[PDB]
């Protein structure tokens, strides 16, 4: 079985490259971030523009939703993260402490902590309510490209240009495991699978890899796309067929069969690198976003 994703909407408004797109957990919204320093909120099903959220002084690399869809956190080159109330658009807290660009961020499932990663090679854990830093982890020896909590919040996975993937104990900040492969190419993205048993990691040698966390072993590799330059997000698609989804530096969205590793669809339409993709939590809908020549977000829908 292959999906049949087709273009339904194109979302214009950002004035520089889009850096990330994420669907709200309640499915109603898409949030986008951009090098233009702005966050924009859109309707997930019709692409209707809702509002612009502003406050960062430099471009934004990442945005993430809280579990209840009420808050966003953003990570900026201005060396801060900001927590936003989506309804009011107000900045609730500014998280200060990183000494260089903040590249990635996420809430835990409880949504009382935020994890961030930075060009300063550290991973920080922040209290959502106070906005203060709880722990600083000397996680890596090069910029940190992604950070993600597992399903019960007890673990954090981080990735870095140093070629390593590390798994951290949230409560203590101590390292539980280091994953290394081949000739340690930069790891540009990492996240836990929905059941927290696997880790999906992108490296800048045109390769995605699925790891068994408990055994520390590679189980699947996904190839065929172009990824040698940018930190491109990847996703598990779980609403219909079980796919792996990723953008690509040849301007396409790639979709693989998770078990067989075969490419099942390539979505054509963007006119620049597809830096970010997101999968809707209940519908067979993908959002994709592209760099400077394109600057748009596209919504695609499939029957399965």
């Amino acid at each position: 079985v292959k999906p049949n994703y087709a273009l339904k909407f194109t979302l214009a408004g950002h004035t520089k490259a889009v850096s990330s797109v994420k669907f709200s957990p309640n499915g109603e919204w898409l949030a986008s971030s951009s090098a233009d320093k702005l966050i924009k909120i859109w309707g997930a099903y019709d692409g209707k523009f809702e509002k612009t959220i502003s406050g960062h002084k430099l471009g934004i690399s990442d945005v993430a939703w809280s579990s209840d869809s009420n808050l966003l956190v953003s990570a900026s080159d201005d060396k801060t993260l900001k927590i936003w109330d989506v309804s009011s658009g107000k900045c609730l807290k500014t998280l200060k402490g990183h000494s260089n660009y903040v590249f990635c961020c996420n809430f835990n499932p409880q949504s009382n902590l935020i994890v961030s990663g930075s060009f300063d090679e550290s991973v920080r854990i922040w209290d959502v309510k106070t906005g203060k830093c709880l722990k600083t982890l000397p996680a890596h020896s090069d910029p940190v490209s992604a950070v993600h909590f597992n399903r019960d919040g007890s673990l954090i996975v981080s990735s870095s240009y140093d070629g390593l993937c590390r798994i951290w104990d949230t409560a203590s900040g101590q390292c539980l495991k280091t994953l290394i492969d081949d000739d340690n190419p930069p790891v540009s993205f990492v996240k836990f699978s929905p059941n927290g048993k696997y880790i999906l990691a992108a490296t800048l040698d045109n390769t995605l890899k699925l790891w068994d966390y408990s055994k520390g072993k590679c189980l699947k590799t996904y190839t065929g796309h172009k990824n040698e330059k940018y930190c491109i997000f990847a996703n598990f698609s779980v609403t219909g067929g079980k796919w792996i989804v990723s953008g690509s530096e040849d301007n396409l969205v790639y979709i693989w069969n998770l078990q067989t590793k075969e490419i099942v669809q390539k979505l054509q339409g963007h006119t620049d690198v597809v830096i970010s993709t997101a999968c809707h939590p209940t519908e067979n809908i993908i959002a994709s976003a592209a760099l400077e020549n394109d600057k748009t977000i596209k919504l695609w829908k499939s029957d399965c």
Binding site: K16, S19, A35, G59, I60, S61, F103, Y230, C231, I275
Partner: peptide
Amino acid sequence: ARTKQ
């Protein structure tokens, strides 16, 4: 940021 090489 992420949008730059």
